[PDB]
Design a protein around this ligand. Structure first.
Ligand SMILES: C[C@@H]1CC[C@@]2(OC1)O[C@H]1C[C@H]3[C@@H]4CC=C5C[C@@H](OCCC(CO[C@H]6O[C@H](CO)[C@@H](O[C@H]7O[C@H](CO)[C@@H](O)[C@H](O)[C@H]7O)[C@H](O)[C@H]6O)CO[C@H]6O[C@H](CO)[C@@H](O[C@H]7O[C@H](CO)[C@@H](O)[C@H](O)[C@H]7O)[C@H](O)[C@H]6O)CC[C@]5(C)[C@H]4CC[C@]3(C)[C@H]1[C@@H]2C
Ligand SMILES: C[C@@H]1CC[C@@]2(OC1)O[C@H]1C[C@H]3[C@@H]4CC=C5C[C@@H](OCCC(CO[C@H]6O[C@H](CO)[C@@H](O[C@H]7O[C@H](CO)[C@@H](O)[C@H](O)[C@H]7O)[C@H](O)[C@H]6O)CO[C@H]6O[C@H](CO)[C@@H](O[C@H]7O[C@H](CO)[C@@H](O)[C@H](O)[C@H]7O)[C@H](O)[C@H]6O)CC[C@]5(C)[C@H]4CC[C@]3(C)[C@H]1[C@@H]2C
Ligand SMILES: COC1=C(OC)C(=O)C(C/C=C(\C)CC/C=C(\C)CC/C=C(\C)CC/C=C(/C)CC/C=C(\C)CC/C=C(\C)CC/C=C(\C)CC/C=C(/C)CCC=C(C)C)=C(C)C1=O
Ligand SMILES: CCCCCCCCCCCCCCCCCC(=O)O[C@@H](COC(=O)CCCCCCCCCCCCCCC)COP(=O)(O)OCC[N+](C)(C)C
Ligand SMILES: CCCCCCCCCCCCCCCCCC(=O)O[C@@H](COC(=O)CCCCCCCCCCCCCCC)COP(=O)(O)OC[C@H](O)CO
Ligand SMILES: CCCCCCCCCCCCCCCCCC(=O)O[C@@H](COC(=O)CCCCCCCCCCCCCCC)COP(=O)(O)OC[C@H](O)CO
Ligand SMILES: CCCCCCCCCCCCCCCCCCCC(=O)O[C@H](COC(=O)CCCCCCCCCCCCCC)COP(=O)(O)OCCN
Ligand SMILES: CCCCCCCCCCCCCCCCCCCC(=O)O[C@H](COC(=O)CCCCCCCCCCCCCC)COP(=O)(O)OCCN
Ligand SMILES: CCCCCCCCCCCCCCCCCCCC(=O)O[C@H](COC(=O)CCCCCCCCCCCCCC)COP(=O)(O)OCCN
Ligand SMILES: CCCCCCCCCCCCCCCCCCCC(=O)O[C@H](COC(=O)CCCCCCCCCCCCCC)COP(=O)(O)OCCN
Ligand SMILES: CCCCCCCCCCCCCCCCCC(=O)OC[C@H](COP(=O)(O)O)OC(=O)CCCCCCCCCCCCCCCCC
Lengths: 64, 101, 324, 174, 94, 58, 100, 488
């Protein structure tokens, strides 16, 4: 969230953070900002990306 | 260094100067500011003297108390003068002097 | 990477030879000041003396006293010797002549210096001898005390340079050697180096005649030799650091084609030799401080002056916008 | 694999910290743990922190511990005790902590299983950030003294407290 | 880049081997002094001072006057502590 | 002129230092084809990795 | 797998500190050492997260936590020293007089 | 640029004054010419002056403390809530200092560094109240904690004081490590440490099935540290030993100010943040445990200090009931309970410090006090009955809200526990009154009369305790104001 990157440029996930914060700054229900929030958290941890790639690896191991 | 004086709670009195310079604030000191300043310094010197008698250092204790009182009283007077110029405190004198110069 | 061990050996072996001959040079210069000859029988002009002494040491039976710290007692000299060796990985001898071009090299040198104390402490404690323990404690306290001033002087150079890279520190002195404007800082650095290497007039472990037993008194054969070799390698390293930080490393004295003819490694070597000669000369010239006096000098003189030089250099460079 | 080696060294050295009968030995093993930690930091690309862990943890803190523990001359009778009767209580507490706390990141940070395909070609390189690279040192120094200077100064206050307390509790002037 | 640290590791391994060879070839043919604690404490404090100096020294060109004065305030606090130690006799070994 | 005896061990030390520089410099040059470059950063490493392709695949 | 491996390293250090508290009932010096081990593990946690998240906040706080660890060890060892000086021993049976 | 620092004028002044006093004390304490005068009382008076000037600067500059809030945002956050919290903290520090002069001169505790450490810890607690980030919160907590560790061991030749310090440092460091671990887990899971960012990330989800175990355990560890700090059961056993073994002025100071600061922190972290029902259940279970254990253990005590320590544990249980029920009235009642408990504790420790001039240790040492000092025995009896919560004394407010929160939230077990523990507490509080008024011991202890400072402080706190419920409107309004300012 801070924006200070470890190599002296804008942090990797800072634009996602700022989109989420700007959404929540005027949407009275946080459920309206769910998509931007999960985009921010996906940028931090890559959970869904790695899960999908592991599904691909799983199917490869099944068909071999 | 990026700076931003903007306060959370807006000023309730006319803003004579949003971010007054140090010397402008000091030159804005009124008689009441000097009274606050002098009272705080005098009380501090008195406390220094009285508390210094038993150890036997009443003079140096007076000096130490006076330094504390000088710094505190100046900070308090500056606080009041700057708050008046910024519109956070009642500032009839500042507004009157501003509408003329 | 297959050729890296060859480079490492080409550093380590000539360094060990250089230490062996630094001992001989110390003896020779000390003798000549004292109107005598020093080693001149074992080999021509005494040039085979170091090999004979090393051979004697390896052929000496080890003692290993019946202590309860059998492992630690032998590992302490290994630790100090390895630490003396590994600082040379980042030392540049000329442009591009360096094993590891560390961007954080200055702090790495500071870390190695800070690690040096453990060999002495462990040797004192493991030897099962109250005299060795007390001497080791005093020596360790002296080294940590002067490390503060060494670090602050490092910071002064860093402020001037703007990079922890030793080669960059050298090349930042192309306009002028840092030892000219910061001459008192260089004097302070040399004295702190004397104290940090337990050298005269700060050589407490050499003060046996003063009822101050050294930390290595229980050592014989090659553990004692390892301590000695590490100490002299550290003397060479401190001379090299003085050369790098203040005398412009491999740079010539004047930016002229006549001086640029001779290689930079020779410039660096000559400056290092000057500083080693000053080490020997100082040992020949003066008596030694007491422990309490040198501790007072470390904390009461060199720390305040080092901090003041940090403040003055930074303030001046910020004021006129001369920062790197 | 390399992280397996360093973690194994850290595990053994830490067990030696907590289980060595002689406290001087505990301090020495502690020093081995900090060396291994510095190795990990070098793997992360944080060379400033890797060096500072040597300078401060080993060069200053461990030296303090060693000076104090060595002059104490602790006899083993004063601190000895059999630990065989703790194996169960350590087993539950360790297991529960193990089952919960070694795997806490697994649901949030799912690992990428390494496949029999060269994913290295999918690494995208942006040269724009490589024109002027910042060291760890200068990235940290860009922030400590300007945008977060208050925390820096509070840390100074903490150190001042340490100095005052050290004097007031232990000083006996000759 | 961390590439330059690999030669340091190989150098350490070789230096260790040289140490073992040299050391192993000859095998073939209750008085607590508080002042040491005090000097340890002082070294710890000024060790952290140098630690905090390093990034500041490399960052002076970017932090400008604000960073300079913030470090000056840091040093002022630590130097007040040093003056306290000096007056109390922590720096006297007699 | 007897004092020249003491200059021989110092000269040997200086030659030793020159060796510790130059021997490691020439071994690196022979192995890599060019002398070591001081200040190898991310950009230089990326340049070398991309140049391997641009050369070998030509 | 990098991030899980870096985290479990720091985690074993933290668990070792906990175990050192549990196993050292007669040795309070080692208890202090175990507390430092936990502090080291937390510091490592901040540094790893800083890299993983590409964020500098973990690094600033790591430096400040090192300062806190230093001050903590200094004051703790002073208190150890004075306790030993009063009792002449570090055994736990001589620091159990406050109770109930 | 200079005007930006109006937001930190109070803190700048107190820090600078503390430095001035440190220099003054060290320069003249070492003076041969002046024959090494004791300076604890001189520095104490000057530091009381400094605290009062800090209070003036802060109270009179209410709007100015919010100036340049964007510039200061990543460092701290000053508002209405922090305003009143910091005023109350400074008032408590001033009272505690005023109670120390007889101890300084009669015991001859000459160390002026005691006052300096108190002032630095006050600086730390001031920064604790305004902390708005996990990093700042941790740093301020650590500064405060290190100052306490040092002052707990100030009687450095005493077995009791050294034992207190050792236990405090070990258990404090352990709890701080646990809290820091929680902070690291939260950062790793959310990429944030600022309280605003944490509020945005955590709100709307709590435990929506896909709950961040990292976030959940970070919260848990932070809560464990907080509960240690407020001496909530089962993280409490440090408190009685430290309270008894420390010098009594230290015990008085620890009994009040850290609670103010850490509850400020707890409100702004949890209440302003979002994991939710789990954490209110944490404080629920710890409140019940604290009430039960405090009541029973206090009933076991034969010594005054230990009795007061266990009493404070029970009362923090009563207070945390308000945090648990998660309503504006809950927060208001928690604040009212802290204010009233603080003024009662100040009264009790003024009496204890007065009696320490004759070395009061046991409850039985109070025998025949109604004969040897009738007005003192009555004053102490009013404090005890207020502690018991007997109306219409001020202490009745906490009992009233304890049952008000249970009956409404549906908590009949909590009401049961409150009834039982209130009766147990009343028994061990009126035991003291019985000792002073009903007993006829063979040997009496005659106590030296207290100094003017403690008599005046006692006189004012005794009028407040007896007469507060005649005019309770300002506290009620100010605490409703504070509860609202947490979210608006
Ligand atoms: C002063 C006092 C003295 C004491 C002291 O200080 C204090 O002295 C100090 C001196 C210190 C030592 C200094 C130095 C090191 C070396 C370091 O070790 C480097 C290891 C790193 C670098 O290794 C490679 O790095 C590059 C490859 O990455 C290589 O580049 C190629 O590849 C490029 C790309 O194609 C091409 O473009 C290039 O052209 C091409 O050349 C490069 O050559 C090579 O170096 C990390 O590598 C690993 O990391 C990988 C990631 O995790 C792991 O991947 C694996 O996991 C993945 C899934 O996660 C799977 O996908 C993978 O399939 C699967 O393999 C895997 O284990 C392994 O690769 C380990 C630490 C240590 C010992 C320090 C210890 C502590 C001290 C003793 C200090 C001590 C305290
Ligand atoms: C007691 C006993 C007695 C006996 C004994 O032991 C002790 O006594 C001991 C005493 C020892 C001697 C001591 C010293 C040397 C000099 C060395 O030779 C110069 C070193 C080589 C490289 O280093 C230079 O170069 C650096 C970079 O410029 C200089 O840096 C500059 O720049 C920096 C940045 O601005 C500034 O910071 C610096 O200030 C600035 O100076 C650096 O200073 C300088 O040293 C000389 O290079 C040349 O060789 C190249 C070959 O490729 C040729 O390249 C050419 O061909 C290429 C291909 O077409 C083209 O691509 C190229 O364009 C094109 O140039 C070309 O001829 C030329 O470059 C040869 C070894 C020897 C004799 C030692 C032998 C062994 C001993 C006799 C020992 C003996 C055993
Ligand atoms: C009086 O002060 C002095 C000392 O301290 C007492 C010395 O140790 C010494 C001498 C110490 C040395 C010569 C150590 C030198 C060691 C080396 C050059 C490295 C090893 C050299 C050798 C000949 C050992 C060879 C070992 C092998 C396994 C052979 C294979 C290679 C002198 C000269 C001295 O003056
Ligand atoms: C109804 C409330 C709920 C129930 C709680 C009751 C709590 C009390 C328990 C009641 C049972 C009996 C209590 C007996 C106490 C009465 C005796 C008493 O307190 O007398 C004191 C009197 O204590 C006081 O001083 C009380 C002062 C309180 C002032 C409150 C009045 C405020 C306005 C009055 C203005 C001044 C006076 C105006 C007229 C001159 C005398 O104290 P000594 O220790 O004996 O001697 C004092 C020393 N000397 C006489 C020399 C000065
Ligand atoms: C409200 C605080 C105002 C400033 C407080 C001054 C701080 C130091 C004064 C402490 C009191 C003091 O000095 O005590 C000495 C003396 O006490 C005093 O005389 C008071 C000193 C000054 C306090 C009052 C003077 C006027 C203060 C007005 C406000 C300023 C010592 O007493 P003794 O040992 O001589 O007792 C013997 C005698 O039998 C007592 O009954
Ligand atoms: C051993 C040495 C001791 C030195 C002690 C003397 C100095 C101590 C520091 C005193 C504070 C500053 C005094 C110097 C006055 C000159 C300040 C000045 O020149 O103004 C500059 C601004 O200077 C400052 O504002 C820095 C003030 C330093 C902070 C000092 C702390 C004061 C109180 C902080 C409150 C936080 C709570 C404290 C926590 C313990 C103008 O800079 P700029 O606005 O043009 O641009 C900013 C910069 O160039 C780009 O980054
Ligand atoms: C302790 C014993 C209590 C003290 C006795 C009662 C105090 C009465 C004195 C005040 C009288 C005159 C006040 C003057 C006044 O209104 O000016 C304001 C000063 O406020 C003030 O002077 C504020 C005083 C606050 C008293 C302490 C409140 C404690 C709250 C309890 C919570 C404790 C729990 C903490 C975790 C600033 O003007 P302003 O009105 O513009 O400023 C706030 C805007 N928002
Ligand atoms: C005698 C008969 C009663 C014995 C105790 C009954 C235990 C069961 C009560 C129970 O269900 O506890 C729930 C949790 O309360 C709790 O707080 C849990 C029980 C109390 C735990 C803390 C106290 C432990 C003991 C402390 C002293 C001993 C220390 C160790 C020796 C109450 O449900 P609820 O009140 O949440 O319902 C809120 C509805 N709106
Ligand atoms: C709300 C319920 C109802 C309350 C009633 C309100 C009425 C207002 C109070 C009126 C006071 C009546 C008496 C006034 C005349 C006495 C003047 C004091 C004389 C004086 O200078 O005292 C000095 C000591 O300071 C002292 O003794 C002063 C310090 C006393 C402590 C109180 C202030 C401490 C700081 C604030 C505490 C706040 C705590 C709340 C959380 C010197 O005395 P000496 O010359 O006899 O020599 C003592 C031996 N050293
Ligand atoms: C944080 C906030 C904490 C502040 C603490 C509040 C004070 C604690 C109360 C303890 C002593 C006060 C005595 C109670 C007053 C008894 C009569 C009540 C009454 O009506 O008196 C009014 C208030 O007097 C007064 O002002 C009472 C005297 C003050 C002492 C004067 O009536 P009014 O008409 O002037 O006021 C408008 C409201 N009736
Ligand atoms: C605030 C920013 C920096 C903070 C840190 C540094 C603060 C500065 C250091 C303060 C330390 C205390 C200094 C005490 C100096 C005492 C001098 C001395 O010996 O005085 C005796 C000396 C001679 O008197 P004797 O003691 O009777 O011989 O001076 C006096 O006693 C003068 C008394 C008259 C002063 C009244 C007016 C005071 C107003 C405030 C100034």
């Amino acid at each position: 969230a801070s924006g200070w990157g470890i190599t002296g440029n804008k942090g990797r996930c800072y634009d996602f953070w700022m989109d989420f914060s700007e959404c929540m700054s005027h949407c009275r229900e946080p459920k309206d900002c769910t998509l931007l929030r999960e985009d921010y958290l996906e940028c931090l941890h890559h959970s869904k990306e790695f899960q999908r790639r592991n599904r691909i690896y799983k199917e490869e191991q099944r068909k071999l | 260094m990026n700076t931003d004086i903007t306060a959370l709670e807006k000023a309730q009195y006319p803003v004579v100067d949003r971010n007054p310079a140090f010397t402008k604030v000091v030159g804005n000191f009124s008689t009441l500011d000097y009274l606050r300043f002098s009272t705080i310094t005098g009380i501090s010197v008195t406390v220094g003297y009285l508390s210094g008698i038993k150890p036997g250092i009443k003079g140096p204790s007076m000096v130490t108390g006076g330094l504390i009182g000088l710094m505190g009283g100046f900070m308090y007077a500056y606080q009041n003068s700057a708050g008046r110029l910024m519109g956070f405190f009642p500032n009839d004198g500042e507004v009157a002097s501003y509408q003329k110069r | 990477y297959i050729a890296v061990p060859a480079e490492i050996l080409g550093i380590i072996l000539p360094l060990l030879l250089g230490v062996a001959f630094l001992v001989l040079a110390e003896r020779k210069v000390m003798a000549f000041v004292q109107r005598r000859k020093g080693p001149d029988v074992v080999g021509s002009f005494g040039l085979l003396q170091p090999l004979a002494d090393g051979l004697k040491l390896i052929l000496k039976e080890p003692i290993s006293p019946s202590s309860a710290n059998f492992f630690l007692f032998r590992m302490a000299p290994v630790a100090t010797f390895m630490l003396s060796l590994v600082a040379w990985a980042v030392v540049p001898f000329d442009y591009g002549m360096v094993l590891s071009d560390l961007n954080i090299g200055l702090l790495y040198l500071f870390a190695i210096s800070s690690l040096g104390v453990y060999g002495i402490i462990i040797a004192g404690r493991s030897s099962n001898s109250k005299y060795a323990f007390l001497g080791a404690l005093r020596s360790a306290a002296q080294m940590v005390s002067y490390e503060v001033s060494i670090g602050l002087i490092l910071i002064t150079v860093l402020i001037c340079v703007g990079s922890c890279n030793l080669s960059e520190i050298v090349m930042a002195q192309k306009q002028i050697w840092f030892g000219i404007p910061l001459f008192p800082v260089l004097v302070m650095f040399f004295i702190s180096c004397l104290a940090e290497t337990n050298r005269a007039p700060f050589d407490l472990p050499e003060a046996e005649a003063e009822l101050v037993a050294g930390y290595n008194v229980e050592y014989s054969s090659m553990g004692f030799a390892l301590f000695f070799l590490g100490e002299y390698a550290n003397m060479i390293l401190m001379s090299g650091l003085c050369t790098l930080f203040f005398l412009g490393g491999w740079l010539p004295i004047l930016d002229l084609p006549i001086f640029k003819k001779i290689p930079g490694s020779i410039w660096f070597s000559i400056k290092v030799l000057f500083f080693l000669f000053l080490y020997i000369w100082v040992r020949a010239a003066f008596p030694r401080y007491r422990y309490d006096q040198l501790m007072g000098l470390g904390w009461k003189v060199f720390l305040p002056l080092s901090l003041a030089w940090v403040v003055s250099v930074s303030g001046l460079l910020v004021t006129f916008q001369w920062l790197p | 694999m390399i992280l397996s080696v360093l973690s194994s060294l850290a595990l053994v050295s830490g067990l030696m910290v907590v289980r060595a009968k002689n406290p001087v030995h505990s301090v020495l093993f502690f020093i081995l743990v900090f060396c291994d930690t510095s190795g990990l930091l070098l793997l992360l690309g944080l060379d400033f922190f890797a060096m500072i862990f040597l300078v401060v943890y080993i060069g200053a803190i461990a030296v303090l511990f060693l000076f104090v523990v060595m002059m104490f001359h602790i006899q083993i009778a004063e601190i000895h005790e059999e630990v065989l009767r703790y194996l169960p209580v350590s087993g539950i507490i360790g297991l529960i902590f193990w089952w919960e706390m070694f795997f806490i990141l697994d649901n949030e940070s799912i690992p990428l299983l390494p496949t029999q395909r060269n994913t290295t070609s999918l690494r995208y390189t942006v040269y724009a950030g490589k024109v002027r690279s910042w060291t760890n040192l200068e990235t940290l120094g860009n922030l400590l003294y300007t945008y977060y200077f208050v925390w820096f100064l509070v840390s100074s206050l903490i150190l001042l407290v340490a100095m005052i307390g050290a004097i007031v509790l232990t000083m006996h002037r000759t | 880049m961390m590439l330059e640290f690999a030669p340091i590791f190989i150098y350490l391994v070789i230096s260790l081997l040289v140490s073992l060879i040299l050391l192993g070839v000859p095998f073939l043919f209750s008085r607590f002094d508080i002042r040491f604690y005090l000097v340890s404490i002082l070294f710890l404090i000024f060790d952290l001072e140098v630690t905090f100096f390093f990034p500041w020294a490399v960052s002076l060109n970017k932090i400008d006057l604000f960073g300079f004065w913030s470090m000056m305030a840091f040093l002022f606090i630590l130097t007040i502590g040093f003056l306290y130690e000096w007056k109390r006799g922590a720096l006297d070994w007699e | 002129l007897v004092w020249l005896e003491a200059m021989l061990p110092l000269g040997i030390i200086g030659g030793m230092l020159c060796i510790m520089g130059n021997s490691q410099y020439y071994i690196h040059k022979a192995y890599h084809g060019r002398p070591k470059h001081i200040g190898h950063d991310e950009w230089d490493v990326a340049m070398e990795r991309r140049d391997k392709k641009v050369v070998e695949k030509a | 797998m990098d991030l899980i491996k870096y985290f479990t390293f720091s985690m074993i250090i933290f668990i070792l500190g906990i175990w050192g508290i549990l196993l050292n009932r007669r040795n309070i010096l080692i208890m202090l050492m175990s507390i430092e081990l936990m502090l080291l593990a937390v510091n490592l946690n901040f540094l790893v997260f800083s890299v993983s998240l590409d964020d500098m906040m973990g690094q600033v706080f790591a430096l400040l936590v090192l300062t806190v660890a230093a001050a903590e060890s200094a004051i703790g060892l002073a208190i150890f020293v004075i306790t030993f000086r009063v009792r002449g021993t570090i055994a736990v049976e001589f620091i159990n007089s406050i109770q109930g | 640029m200079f005007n930006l620092f109006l937001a930190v004028f109070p803190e700048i002044f107190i820090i600078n004054a503390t430095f001035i006093l440190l220099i003054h004390g060290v320069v003249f304490s070492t003076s041969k010419k002046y024959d090494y005068p004791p300076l604890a009382s001189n520095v104490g008076w000057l530091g009381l002056l400094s605290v009062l000037i800090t209070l003036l600067l802060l109270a009179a500059g209410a709007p100015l403390l919010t100036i340049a809030h964007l510039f200061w945002n990543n460092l701290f956050r000053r508002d209405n809530f922090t305003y009143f919290c910091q005023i109350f903290l400074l008032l408590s520090t001033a009272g505690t200092i005023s109670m120390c002069f007889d101890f300084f001169d009669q015991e001859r505790f000459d160390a002026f560094e005691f006052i300096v450490l108190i002032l630095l810890s006050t600086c730390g607690m001031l920064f604790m109240i305004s902390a708005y980030d996990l990093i700042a919160m941790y740093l301020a907590i650590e500064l405060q904690s290190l100052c306490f560790y040092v002052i707990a061991a100030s009687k450095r030749k005493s077995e009791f004081s050294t034992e207190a310090g050792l236990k405090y440092l070990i258990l404090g460091a352990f709890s701080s490590g646990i809290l820091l671990f929680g902070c690291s887990m939260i950062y790793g899971s959310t990429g944030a440490t600022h309280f605003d960012q944490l509020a945005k990330i955590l709100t709307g989800y709590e435990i929506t099935g896909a709950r961040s175990s990292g976030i959940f355990m970070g919260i848990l560890f932070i809560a464990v540290g907080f509960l240690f700090k407020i001496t909530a059961v089962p993280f409490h056993m440090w408190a009685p030993d430290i309270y008894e073994g420390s010098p009594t002025p230290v015990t008085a100071f620890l009994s009040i100010a850290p609670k103010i600061s850490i509850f400020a922190n707890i409100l702004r972290v949890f209440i302003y943040g979002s994991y939710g029902a789990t954490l209110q259940q944490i404080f629920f279970f710890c409140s019940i445990a604290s009430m039960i254990l405090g009541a029973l253990a206090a009933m076991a005590q034969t010594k005054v200090k230990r009795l007061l320590a266990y009493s404070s544990i029970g009362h923090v249980g009563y207070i945390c009931i308000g945090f648990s029920c998660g309503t504006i009235e809950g927060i208001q009642s928690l604040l009212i309970g802290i204010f009233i408990y603080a003024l009662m504790t100040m009264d009790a420790f003024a009496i204890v410090l007065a009696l320490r001039q004759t070395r009061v240790k046991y409850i039985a040492d109070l025998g025949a006090l109604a004969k040897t000092n009738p007005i003192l025995a009555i004053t102490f009896s009013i404090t005890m009955f207020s502690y018991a919560g007997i109306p219409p004394l001020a202490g009745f407010c906490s009992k009233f809200y304890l049952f008000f929160a249970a009956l409404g939230c549906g908590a009949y077990f909590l009401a049961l526990v409150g009834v039982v523990t209130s009766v147990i507490g009343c028994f061990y509080y009126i035991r003291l009154v019985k000792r002073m008024f009903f007993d006829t011991p063979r040997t009496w202890i005659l106590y030296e009369p207290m100094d003017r400072n403690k008599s005046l402080l006692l006189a004012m706190t005794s009028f407040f305790i007896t007469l507060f419920l005649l005019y309770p409107s300002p506290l009620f309004s100010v605490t409703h104001q504070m509860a609202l300012s947490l979210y608006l």
